[PDB]
Amino acid sequence: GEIAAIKQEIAAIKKEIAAIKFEIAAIKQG
Amino acid sequence: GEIAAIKQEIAAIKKEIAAIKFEIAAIKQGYG
Amino acid sequence: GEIAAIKQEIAAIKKEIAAIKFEIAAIKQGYG
Question: Total structural domains in chain B?
Fold first, then answer.
């Protein structure tokens, strides 16, 4: 259960990193 | 132990992500 | 190997975050 939750958190963080990289690229366009 | 250390790392990472998102919010509003 | 894989994921995330923090500094930087 603890392991399931930690892996879920890792996936959510990677999801945010992906989101961040797209935001940064949009800012650079300009 | 091992699992505990992994949780501290994940917790510190989450703070860094929150700071980055806010910085990005600030930049898009002309505060950076 | 499974727990080592989780530790690799964490080290990779840390490298991505440091690179992001550099990119944000570069977006912000002026001639100061």
Answer: 1
Is C31 a member of any domain? no
Residue B30 domain boundaries: 1-32
Q: What is the resolution of this structure in A?
A: 2.3
A11–chain B nearest CA distance, Å: 11
Deposited experimental method:
X-ray
- Please give the residue of chain A at the shortest CA–CA distance from B11: A9
The Cα angle at residue C14 between residues C19 and A12, in degrees rounded to 5 = 105
Which residue on chain B is closest to A20 by alpha carbon? Answer: B21
H or E stretch covering C25: helix C2-28
CB atoms closer than 10 angstroms to residue A1: 5
